[PDB]
């Protein structure tokens, strides 16, 4: 979410008096948005709480030996008969589960 | 102001032509989203700025 979302509007708080809830409201105007409340997460329009940043830690790195261990385990589970059916593959008519075919 | 200038008179002449409403055939088209003229400026309600 962009950082300009919500903070483009200028809104000074009225403060005490005027039986209002002490919220920064839009400075005057003869229009539907006049004394409405711009800033804050709870107000209509404006900004949400905690704008999601572009510099979030999206990517997680894995050790190379752990990656190779994952490859070895994923290949070794493809030889056992029960682990393939528990994935869900219909393998009832396959003649051999280590299915090795010719180079053609 | 009876003592008008030509620029102000032309500016009022364009707004007098903009003051007219919509025709009746314009809401018969396919992709219409216009029910009525929303820019009807009345001479007592909106004082044209200035």
């Amino acid at each position: 979410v962009s950082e300009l979302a919500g903070h483009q509007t200028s809104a000074e708080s009225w403060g005490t008096g005027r039986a209002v809830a002490r919220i920064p409201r839009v400075r005057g105007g003869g229009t539907h948005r006049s004394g409405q409340g711009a800033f804050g997460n709870m107000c209509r329009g404006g900004r949400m709480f905690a704008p999601t940043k572009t510099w979030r830690r999206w990517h997680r790195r894995v050790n190379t030996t752990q990656k190779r261990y994952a490859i070895c385990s994923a290949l070794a589970a493809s030889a056992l008969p029960a682990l393939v059916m528990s994935k869900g593959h219909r393998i009832e008519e396959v003649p051999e589960l280590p299915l090795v075919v010719e180079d053609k | 102001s009876s003592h008008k200038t030509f620029r102000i008179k032309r500016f009022l002449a364009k707004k007098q032509k903009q003051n007219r409403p919509i025709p009746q055939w314009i809401w018969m088209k396919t992709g219409n989203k216009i029910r009525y003229n929303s820019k009807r400026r009345h001479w007592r309600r909106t004082k044209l700025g200035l």
Binding site: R18, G29, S34, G35 | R45
Partner: peptide, 24 residues
């Protein structure tokens, strides 16, 4: 048309009015 604005603050119950003043 014009959206009637927020009712202008009328500085009343403050200090310059001698109608309502507590204990001083």
């Amino acid at each position: 048309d014009p959206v009637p604005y927020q009712p202008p603050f009328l500085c009343q119950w403050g200090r310059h009015q001698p109608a309502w003043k507590p204990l001083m």
